[PDB]
Design a protein around this ligand. Structure first.
Ligand code: SF4
Lengths: 269, 96, 176, 464, 296, 231
């Protein structure tokens, strides 16, 4: 029943030579319907970057502690806190010391962003990663989680300023960037966000233009069943692949996935 | 949480062999029938979750055996019968 | 129309550990051997019940013998019913017939059992007829000799208790 | 063309299985004892056929003649009609009533005015407006060999024996007088006689869960005993006058929601073997008198949307039929092949032959063949040597256009001969038979008499 | 570590975690944990102008006071249970609105040892009497967010022993909340900081809130619904269905209901990737004793 | 005490002001204005043998009607003075349910939404009985909602519908050979076919009662013989 998870022509999810090529950049865009959460995919990405294989889906997860590995990993998010990241991701056993974890929720709201000039806020939030990645320059992967929420935090900010002040510098400085977000704004029944709420959707469209691969986790259609949870889509993003080899491209396939007790299963219709 | 759901239906000769089919259909147990006629044999009996009898099949063993445990495969294919010396594997196709 | 055929038939003998150079057995019989969770390991436990000594050691896929605990209980004639290991928090669970649930603690870097601690968490009086774990290693159900069944959590807290009775019979025949 | 279905009604009566259980089965609505009291059981008397039957005071001659003339006057011309009987248990009634009923039903079309049913059927064989069989409804307790001989003499071709469940508590708690296991021997004896057999099912019943509903259907389709040639699924709807409404009144009953039922139907339709014709998941109900349940007019209209979202769409006969002529010939079909399946069912081996398009899975023609066994046959025709029976011939391959160079002006008129000779080949080679027989309605006893089959008793047979 | 008092808590049958109880009859049953896990907030919603949910907004809070008031020389175990309930409203009528205990029965059977569990309640009976400011406090919402965020942290820090239960009665009611706070940044930052504080003290703090959605633009609702970890929606019947039920139901006054229940989000169950949305299956009813949720 | 009122009798009961709430909303358009509605109010209110003193607030009315006793014109003067002048002809006492000072408003389009509540929070006294009118078709001024990403505040219609205890709306029946589709087509062209501003109109009524529930009522109203019937 079970099927392998392949995302490239080289029969490998995350090619190693991507990290071996200098003067290059790449961007992944992941969208999940907010009735489900893509954590079980972030875990797989981190394991396959560090351990070199999907250590929860295709491989066993009994030695899942990538701490103090020759590689590196940096995760930052706004939706949750440092306490949740430590306690949970260590209960999920996501590494610590060869690893960086960044909160922007706990105690950050209380007059540390509020009632301060916007330019200083943007400069400092960029400098956090600009300084946290100086240690290991070329063997890290960085993922940001739902950054568009910050748009609603800053007093009167549009897509363009946030994008050109946060996203593009991050991808220029770092090798590869992964951005994950949710898409409820496009799923309000009998209401059009295109009336006056297009500012947020502009960010999604811009990111999809700039992205290289597009990962989609979407819920089932009309009803709810037991043996299947959701649908998994892989698509080619807007930007082309900045690699140096020529035969490389992206495989094109759709999966049906079930999640239960942190255990995920993928198969075909 | 430790509540009661149902209690089994009394049958004659039911031994201490208890095992559940992983798919979730039938309880497997061992019965010995020593009554008159030629019906006397050693059988395997299946019990629904409501404590109601359903299905049966006889082993061709002599009536003097002593079976220790009955094992369901990790899937719904193999049934392992455990004896003192021999261990037997049974599987079904077309309900036979 | 298919048939079943045999591919492999492997075997070995768990070698009991003693300080002697020849290092033969001490009438140590194995009580339980398990399938470890796909980590190329087989955790076995042996012992001598009359003197009251037990030993748990992992057999590696290559064949390297590693001992994590070898401890002697003060009492004897205490037969086991279920031993498991979580392999994520790295503890050990033993179920004895007298009523003691044994919780052992070990470290990965400690090759020798010198740092394996023991805990004798709350006893169940009047012995225990049987006990069993679930597939997910979360629910601990057991039955005492006095027709009382108790369900405990994964952290040794009581989910519930209930007195099994011959007078309880949900008959399949009511005349309504 | 001109296939016609003309339903008739029998006089009201009482099925005797009430006698040893006390009342009608719980789900049966209406009846003589109910307030209606001029109506056969399982029918409220408010159907159009009920109206046409009442005004004729339940007479077969008038009902048949009136329905035939109405259909002819509407704009269709009829030359092929199949009768279907309804209501209670027709076989319970005394001897003379059934004989007179059948003789009247045949003399309505034949134009004959005699008696001595043998002569009536003999004249009906040589008549215009041919009859293509009868459909008699009967219970397991009345399918003994004498009754089977009666039905064979009458001219019936297919039965429909309901089971309604496979569990054993349901039989006693629904006040239905037969153990489940006896239906298997009923099927075994019936099939060896050449009678196509169809059953009934009802998903929701008291003290039945969604699980048990699932694996009862799974066991029905998998077990080599419950393999039959048709099915009917009746979702449980609660009429006020039934014994089901009392349970809801006392609070001893509750039904399923809409989502649960649509999911159940979606799962069920994804398991049908490709030789069984799902008749009606969207059955016909007395609408306003139902008090509990859900709407059933478009269950499959949503189940199809469900299979399009989960995959593995239906594979029954009905969805794959192309018809006699130009139903879906708006597009030229694809590769045509012969597909032959074999299965073990009710103590015997049976073969299903079909002419199908494998790329898009449509159906053009089919044939069924059975190798007679030795532990169930009793007829003096089948107890003399080995023999095989063609239970059903079905040729929608009367299609004029086709794929892969259809006959120009011969237009598949010899298409059925292909299947007939194909059947004879394996009858001579594989079965090793010494006689082959085909069962058919009396009106079509000549489309088989040209290929060499000769008449013996109610059968069309030829040796090897 | 530090000292802590849990006013009442049992292991979660579903995942072996500390779980409190709202005091409800079937709402605690449908939360998946047979209760509310220690740390995850909840949300309940009503379609129309009715005020059914208001009743629930009382029960929870009252339960805590009981769980604190039946320990002072009224519980032989004298078990350490302390709560300091905080209410954010511009009207103080709640200070004299807690419903009365029916007969007690805080049994759970079917740091200290916590056996306390739900009580028996009835709506007609008022409480006897009501807590003093030392047990329960009111904060007006119209003050600037800086003062509120400082004061909540001060209250929790200065009362480290106590268990924390917070209730927000009818958040975003136009009769008390001015348009100058309907601006997008204000409320979302307020709740973002509230979630920060709540999960910071994950051991014992629990929060509860409810709003009205008929007068809220969908974008703000979407922004808000990701802040919490559980969403329950109550939709009352139309007039026609009510008249149909009353015309059909002639032998039962108690079988009359008011509407149905929809499940949009659950506790930790959902964060492991579980599709838990389930709508148009349950039915709610307000009653003389408690709040009933049954199948329809 | 009377309860479970006859729907026509209940319609009279509200129209006779046997019951009373500190806020009543009435809606009108350019197809049927509400002068005859006030006529019905005074016809079925003072027929009980009651005076019902009336205070008038005008934003669109030009002349002093016969209904009102006192007078105040609010076009020249503004909010900060109307909050004063409203109390001058309105005592702060109890009992809306009976003969008190009834404050009537002809139009509510010309007050900023940002201060709708600040207004209404200081008028609906337990002696005060408020009734107001709103023009449905007239589009709200673009500077009342601020359609930017900051302002999540609702519009004017929903705010009034959520706040008012009881809602009454009216529409004109076209006795002619036309259809309301053609009437809308011509009105979108700003054309008036013959048959508008009649006297036999249709009405829609909603009252919030029983802890918040509501029931919609429809009738047929003749404003000459004062005939209320079912539709
Ligand atoms: S056997 Fe048929 S006719 Fe008799 S009670 Fe049952 S359903 Fe009705």
């Amino acid at each position: 029943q079970r099927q392998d998870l392949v995302l490239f022509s080289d029969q490998s999810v995350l090619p190693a030579h991507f990290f071996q090529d200098s003067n290059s950049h790449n961007l992944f865009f992941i969208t999940h319907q907010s009735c489900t959460q893509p954590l079980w995919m972030i875990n797989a990405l981190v394991e396959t970057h560090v351990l070199g294989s999907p250590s929860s889906l295709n491989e066993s997860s009994s030695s899942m502690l990538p701490s103090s590995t020759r590689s590196h990993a940096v995760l930052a998010s706004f939706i949750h806190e440092q306490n949740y990241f430590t306690n949970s991701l260590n209960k999920l056993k996501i590494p610590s010391n060869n690893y960086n974890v960044l909160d922007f929720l706990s105690d950050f709201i209380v007059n540390n962003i509020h009632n301060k000039p916007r330019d200083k806020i943007l400069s400092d939030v960029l400098a956090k990663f600009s300084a946290a990645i100086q240690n290991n320059p070329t063997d890290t992967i960085v993922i940001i989680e739902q950054p568009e929420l910050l748009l609603s935090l800053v007093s009167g900010l549009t897509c363009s300023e946030l994008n050109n002040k946060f996203i593009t510098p991050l991808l220029r400085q770092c090798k590869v960037l992964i951005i994950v977000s949710n898409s409820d704004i496009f799923n309000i029944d009998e209401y059009d966000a295109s009336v006056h709420s297009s500012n947020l959707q502009n960010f999604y469209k811009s990111s999809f233009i700039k992205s290289m691969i597009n990962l989609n986790l979407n819920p089932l259609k009309t009803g709810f069943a037991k043996d299947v949870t959701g649908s998994l889509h892989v698509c080619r993003g807007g930007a082309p692949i900045a690699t140096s080899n020529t035969s490389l491209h992206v495989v094109e396939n759709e999966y049906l996935y079930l999640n239960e007790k942190e255990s995920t299963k993928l198969f075909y219709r | 949480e430790g509540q009661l759901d149902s209690a089994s239906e009394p049958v004659t000769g039911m031994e201490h062999q208890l095992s559940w089919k992983p798919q979730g259909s039938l309880i497997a147990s061992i019965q010995r029938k020593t009554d008159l006629g030629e019906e006397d044999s050693v059988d395997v009996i299946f019990f629904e979750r409501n404590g109601l009898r359903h299905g049966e099949f006889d082993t061709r063993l002599p009536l003097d055996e002593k079976v220790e445990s009955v094992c369901w495969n990790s899937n719904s294919e193999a049934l392992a019968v455990v004896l003192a010396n021999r261990i037997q594997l049974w599987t079904s196709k077309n309900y036979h | 129309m298919r048939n079943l055929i045999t591919l492999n038939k492997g075997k070995f003998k768990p070698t009991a550990s003693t300080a002697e150079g020849d290092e033969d057995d001490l009438s140590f019989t194995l009580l339980d051997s398990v399938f470890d969770t796909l980590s190329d390991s087989i955790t076995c436990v042996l012992g001598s019940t009359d003197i009251g000594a037990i030993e748990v050691q992992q057999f590696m896929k290559d064949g390297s013998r590693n001992v994590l605990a070898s401890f002697n209980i003060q009492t004897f004639d205490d037969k086991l019913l279920s031993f498991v290991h979580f392999a994520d928090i790295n503890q050990l669970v033993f179920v004895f017939e007298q009523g003691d649930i044994i919780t052992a603690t070990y470290d990965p870097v400690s090759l020798d059992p010198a740092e394996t601690l023991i805990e004798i968490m709350g006893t169940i009086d009047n012995g225990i007829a049987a006990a069993q774990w679930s597939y997910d290693e979360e629910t601990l159900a057991m039955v005492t000799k006095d027709r009382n069944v108790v369900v405990l959590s994964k952290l040794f807290e009581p989910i519930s208790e209930y007195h099994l009775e011959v007078d309880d019979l949900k008959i399949s025949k009511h005349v309504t | 063309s001109g296939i016609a279905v003309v339903a008739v009604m029998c006089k009201p009566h009482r099925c005797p299985h009430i006698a040893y259980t006390g009342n009608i089965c719980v789900y049966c609505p209406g009846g003589p004892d109910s307030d209606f009291e001029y109506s056969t059981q399982s029918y409220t008397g408010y159907e159009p056929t009920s109206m046409r039957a009442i005004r004729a005071r339940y007479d077969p001659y008038e009902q048949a003649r009136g329905r035939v003339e109405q259909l002819k006057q509407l704009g269709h011309s009829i030359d092929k009609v199949e009768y279907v009987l309804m209501g209670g248990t027709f076989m319970s009634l005394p001897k003379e009533y059934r004989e007179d009923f059948i003789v009247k039903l045949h003399n309505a079309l034949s134009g004959f005015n005699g008696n001595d049913i043998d002569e009536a059927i003999l004249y009906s064989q040589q008549s215009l407006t041919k009859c293509v069989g009868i459909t008699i409804e009967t219970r397991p307790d009345y399918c003994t060999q004498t009754h089977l001989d009666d039905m064979l003499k009458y001219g019936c071709t297919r039965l429909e024996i309901g089971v309604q469940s496979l569990y054993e508590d349901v039989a006693r708690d629904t006040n239905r007088g037969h153990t489940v296991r006896s239906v298997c021997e009923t099927f075994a004896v019936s099939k060896d006689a050449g009678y196509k057999v169809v059953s009934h099912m009802m998903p929701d019943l008291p003290n039945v869960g969604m699980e048990r509903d699932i694996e009862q259907f799974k066991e029905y389709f998998e077990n080599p005993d419950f393999r039959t040639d048709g099915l009917k699924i009746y979702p449980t709807l609660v009429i006020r006058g039934t014994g089901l409404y009392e349970l809801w009144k006392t609070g001893r009953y509750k039904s399923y929601s809409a989502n649960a039922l649509v999911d159940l139907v979606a799962r069920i339709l994804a398991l049908v073997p490709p030789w069984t014709r799902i008749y009606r998941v969207q059955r016909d109900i007395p609408m306003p008198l139902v008090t509990s349940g859900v709407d059933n007019g478009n269950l499959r209209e949503l189940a199809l949307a469900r299979m399009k979202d989960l995959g593995t769409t239906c594979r029954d006969v009905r969805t794959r039929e192309v018809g006699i002529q130009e139903v879906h010939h708006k597009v030229q079909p694809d590769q045509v092949e012969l597909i032959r399946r074999d299965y073990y069912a009710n103590g015997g081996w049976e073969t299903f032959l079909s002419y199908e398009d494998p790329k898009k899975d449509i159906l053009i023609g089919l044939l069924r063949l059975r190798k007679a066994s030795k532990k169930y046959t009793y007829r003096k025709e089948f107890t003399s040597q080995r023999t095989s029976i063609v239970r059903e011939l079905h040729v929608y391959g009367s299609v004029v256009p086709l794929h892969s160079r259809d006959p120009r002006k011969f237009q598949h008129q010899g298409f059925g001969t292909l299947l007939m000779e194909e059947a004879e080949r394996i009858a001579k080679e594989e079965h090793g038979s010494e006689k082959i027989s085909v069962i058919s309605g009396v009106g079509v006893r000549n489309y088989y008499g040209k290929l060499g089959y000769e008449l013996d008793g109610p059968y069309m047979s030829k040796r090897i | 570590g530090l000292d802590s008092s849990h006013v009442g808590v049992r292991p979660s049958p579903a995942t072996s975690q500390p779980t409190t109880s709202t005091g409800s009859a079937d709402l605690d049953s449908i939360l998946g944990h047979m209760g509310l896990p220690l740390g995850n907030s909840v949300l309940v919603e009503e379609q129309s102008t009715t005020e059914f949910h208001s009743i629930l907004g009382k029960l929870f809070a009252a339960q805590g006071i009981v769980h604190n008031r039946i320990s002072d020389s009224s519980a032989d175990k004298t078990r350490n249970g302390d709560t300091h309930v905080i209410v954010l409203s511009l009207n103080q009528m709640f200070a004299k609105e807690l419903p009365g205990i029916y007969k007690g029965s805080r049994k759970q059977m079917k740091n200290s040892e916590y056996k306390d569990y739900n009580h028996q309640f009835d709506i007609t009976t008022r409480l006897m009497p009501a807590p003093i400011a030392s047990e329960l406090t009111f904060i007006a919402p119209t003050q600037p967010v800086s003062t509120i965020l400082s004061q909540i942290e001060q209250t929790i820090k200065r009362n480290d022993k106590k268990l924390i239960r917070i209730v927000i009665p009818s958040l975003l009611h136009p009769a008390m909340y001015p348009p100058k706070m309907f601006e997008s940044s204000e409320i979302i930052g307020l709740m973002h900081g509230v979630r920060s504080l709540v999960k910071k003290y994950y051991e014992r703090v629990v929060l509860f809130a409810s709003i009205s959605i008929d007068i809220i633009t969908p974008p703000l609702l979407v922004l808000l619904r990701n802040m919490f970890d559980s969403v329950i929606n109550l939709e009352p019947f139309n007039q026609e269905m009510t008249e149909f039920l009353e015309r059909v139901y002639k032998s039962q006054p108690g079988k009359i209901q008011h509407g149905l229940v929809h499940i949009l989000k659950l506790p930790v169950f959902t964060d492991r990737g579980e599709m838990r949305v389930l709508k148009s299956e349950w039915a709610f009813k307000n009653g003389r004793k408690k709040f009933e949720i049954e199948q329809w | 005490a009377s309860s479970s009122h006859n729907p026509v009798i209940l319609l009279k009961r509200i129209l006779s002001l046997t019951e009373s709430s500190p806020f009543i909303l009435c809606l009108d358009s350019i197809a049927q204005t509400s002068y005859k509605l006030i006529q019905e109010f005074v016809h079925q209110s003072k027929s009980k043998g009651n005076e019902y003193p009336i205070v008038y607030i005008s934003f669109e009315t030009v002349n002093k009607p016969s209904y009102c006793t006192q007078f105040i014109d609010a076009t020249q003067m503004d909010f900060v003075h109307l909050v004063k002048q409203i109390i001058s002809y309105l005592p702060a006492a109890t009992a809306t349910q009976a003969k008190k000072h009834m404050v009537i408003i002809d139009s509510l389009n010309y007050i900023s939404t940002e201060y709708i509540t600040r207004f209404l929070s200081e008028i609906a006294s337990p002696h005060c009985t408020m009734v107001a009118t709103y023009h449905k078709d007239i589009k709200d001024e673009n500077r009342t909602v601020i359609p930017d990403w900051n302002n999540n505040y609702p519009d004017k219609l929903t705010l009034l519908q959520f706040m008012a205890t009881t809602i009454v709306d009216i529409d004109v029946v076209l006795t002619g050979t036309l259809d309301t589709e053609e009437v809308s087509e011509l009105l979108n062209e700003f054309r008036i076919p013959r048959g508008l501003n009649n006297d036999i109109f249709q009405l829609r009524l909603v009252n919030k009662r029983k802890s918040g529930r509501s029931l919609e009522y429809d009738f047929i109203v003749n404003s000459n013989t004062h005939e209320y019937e079912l539709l």
